[PDB]
């Protein structure tokens, strides 16, 4: 039920929207979380998605880490989407503020190819410190499945479209 998106390529679409509000409206099969390896959902997209689940995402995530240990940077796991989606794909992009290899951003986006359609944010952008223009380029050159990107910041959305 996606509406109001701008088409960038055959399979990539973009909209100026809060991914939480978009998930509540659409209830997609998969919402992507901008996760860290510990699944500690404190701020940014992860903090906002978790708060919309009334902390149920963090309780589920703590049980997953207690059983499996941390994810790899560039890796992912599929957990419940709670009241927002059928599933949440938690994907770890590199955090440039922590010195992580930006080359891992392509490996992070490759996780999206296991799902036919996804609602997602730009990986490694925002508080993860990478250039969002670079993140959008890696997304369109890596993802082959249908990805609906939600960009919260209006000024960033306008810059991403104008420079595409």
Ligand X SMILES: O=C(O)[C@H]1C[C@@H](O)CN1c1ncnc2[nH]ccc12
Half-sphere exposure of residue 104: CA atoms within 13 angstroms, side-chain side: 17
Question: Counting contacts by CB under 6 A, is residue 93 touching ligand X?
Answer: no
Give the CA distances from residue 153 to residues 49, 79, 96, in Å, rounded to whole numbers and listed in that order.
16, 27, 20
**Cα gap 75→137, rounded to integer Å:** 19
**Distance, C-alpha 132 to centroid of its chain:** 13
Residue with tokens 């703590």: 62
Exactly one of 84, 125, 130, 147 binds ligand X (CB under 6 A); that residue is 125
Exactly one of 104, 122, 138, 139 binds ligand X (CB under 6 A); that residue is 122
- Interacting residues with ligand X between 6 and 35 (CB under 6 A): 18-20
Closest CB 68 distance from ligand X, rounded Å: 26
Binding to ligand X by CB under 6 A, coded x per residue (else -) over 133-152, reads: -----------------xxx
**Helices 154-162, 132-142: inter-axial angle, 10-degree rounding:** 60
Question: Counting contacts by CB under 6 A, is residue 71 touching ligand X?
Answer: no
Residue number of the CB atom closest to ligand X = 126
Q: Which residues bind ligand X (CB under 6 A)?
A: 18-20, 44-45, 48, 121-122, 125-126, 150-153, 156
């Amino acid at each position: 039920s996606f509406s109001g998106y701008l088409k960038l390529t055959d399979n990539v679409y973009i909209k100026n929207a809060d991914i939480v509000e978009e998930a509540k409206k659409v209830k997609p099969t998969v919402v992507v979380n901008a996760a860290n390896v510990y699944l500690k959902h404190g701020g940014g997209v992860a903090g906002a998605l978790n708060k919309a689940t009334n902390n149920a995402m963090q309780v589920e995530s703590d049980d997953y880490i207690a059983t499996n240990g941390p994810l790899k940077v560039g890796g992912s796991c599929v957990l419940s989407g709670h009241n927002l989606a059928k599933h949440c794909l938690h994907v770890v992009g590199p955090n440039v503020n922590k010195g992580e290899d930006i080359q891992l951003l392509k490996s992070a986006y490759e996780n999206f190819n296991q799902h036919e359609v996804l609602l997602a944010p730009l990986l490694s952008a925002g508080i993860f410190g990478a250039d969002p223009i670079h993140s959008l380029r890696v997304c369109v050159d890596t993802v082959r499945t249908n990805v609906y990107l939600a960009v919260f910041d209006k000024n960033l959305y306008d810059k991403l479209v104008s420079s595409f």
